[PDB]
Homo-oligomer: A and B are copies of this chain.
Amino acid sequence: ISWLDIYHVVSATVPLYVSMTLGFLSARHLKLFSPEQCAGINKFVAKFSIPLLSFQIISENNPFKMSPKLILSDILQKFLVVVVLAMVLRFWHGGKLGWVITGLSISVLPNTLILGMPILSAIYGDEAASILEQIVVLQSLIWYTILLFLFELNAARAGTMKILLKAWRKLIINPNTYATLIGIIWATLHFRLGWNLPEMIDKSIHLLSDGGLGMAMFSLGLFMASQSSIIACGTKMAIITMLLKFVLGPALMIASAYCIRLKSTLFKVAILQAALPQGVVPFVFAKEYNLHPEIISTGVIFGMLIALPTTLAYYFLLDL
């Protein structure tokens, strides 16, 4: 672990905190944004920035050149996490479905796009970049849509066939689903027939997509200024939010990798990626749907602080 490699991690993490700070200061000390305005900014982030980012992620990779072992391992990890959460909730802590979503939003949705590429590139070779790209594409194609479907189903519940039909009806109009579908279609078209996206469309998409992550962090800092303080999540809930993200998710990912027989850099990069801090998109969704938005906030705040400790610990463990 070269000392100059810690500089890379810190440089990848600090910018995601500068915007968050700016937002917190604007909301609390400057009293610049009212709660309605913060909700509107978050809605813009969730409706225009995230769909375009997902489209770009999905439309810039080879759908037919993708490690199937990586896909199977990710699916197995997600299924195992869902099963474990369902089993635990049955005996621990009504409103059980609301906690299954809040578990997947802090367990099986890392932030490999921002904090993953630099950390893995510094600690591993170029192949890790491709593996992380594939993981991000999968989580922005399948998992980010399944999470939205679950959110819609939870909102509708607040006779079963009617609820499912309502959830599907509300999902089909969601920008994220259409963005993902168009992204996959364009990816296959461009990588089979060689079609290239016209410049007037690529630039238009980039203009809105660009700066979306800064806006998401701004919204995260804005929402954290309307809570009790910085750990409004609580004391025990904040402690378990990290055992779910750095002690259970990584273990289940290791189990999935063992089951799928991963033996390559597709192992030391497939497991380490699962120990990275939480993403911002899960918060962007959990605050628009108002499903425990305080639990996926302190987790984000305190996950990028311990990213380096836990990541280096897992790196040492894998080598041993």
Interface residue ranges, A against B (CB under 8 Å): 10-11, 14-16, 18-19, 22, 26, 32-34, 36-41, 43-44, 47-49, 199-200, 203-204, 206-215, 217-218
Task: From the candidates B204, B211, B217, B218, name the one contacting A15 in the complex (CB within 8 A).
Answer: B204
Alpha-carbon distance A212/B33, docked complex (angstroms): 17
- Copies, count: 2
Q: Is the interface of A mostly helix, strand, loop or mixed?
A: helix
CB distance from A272 to the nearest CB of B (A): 21
Cross-chain contact B218 with A214 (CB below 8 angstroms): no
Residue of B nearest to A217 (CB): B207
Alpha-carbon distance A217/B32, docked complex (angstroms): 21
Residues in B with CB closer than 8 Å to A199 are 11
Cross-chain contact A47 with B18 (CB below 8 angstroms): no
Cross-chain contact B33 with A36 (CB below 8 angstroms): no
Knowing A203-B11, A207-B15, the reply to whether A44 touches B47 (Cβ < 8 A) is no
Residues in B with CB closer than 8 Å to A213 are 207
Cross-chain contact A40 with B38 (CB below 8 angstroms): yes
Alpha-carbon distance A47/B40, docked complex (angstroms): 16
- 5 CB contacts below 8 A, A to B, read A19-B208, A34-B40, A211-B212, A211-B214, A211-B215
Alpha-carbon distance A14/B205, docked complex (angstroms): 11
Alpha-carbon distance A210/B214, docked complex (angstroms): 8
Cross-chain contact B218 with A48 (CB below 8 angstroms): yes
Residues in B with CB closer than 8 Å to A44 are 32-33, 37, 41, 218
CB distance from A138 to the nearest CB of B (A): 25
Alpha-carbon distance A48/B26, docked complex (angstroms): 10
Alpha-carbon distance A138/B19, docked complex (angstroms): 28
Residues in B with CB closer than 8 Å to A209 are 211
Residues in B with CB closer than 8 Å to A49 are 211
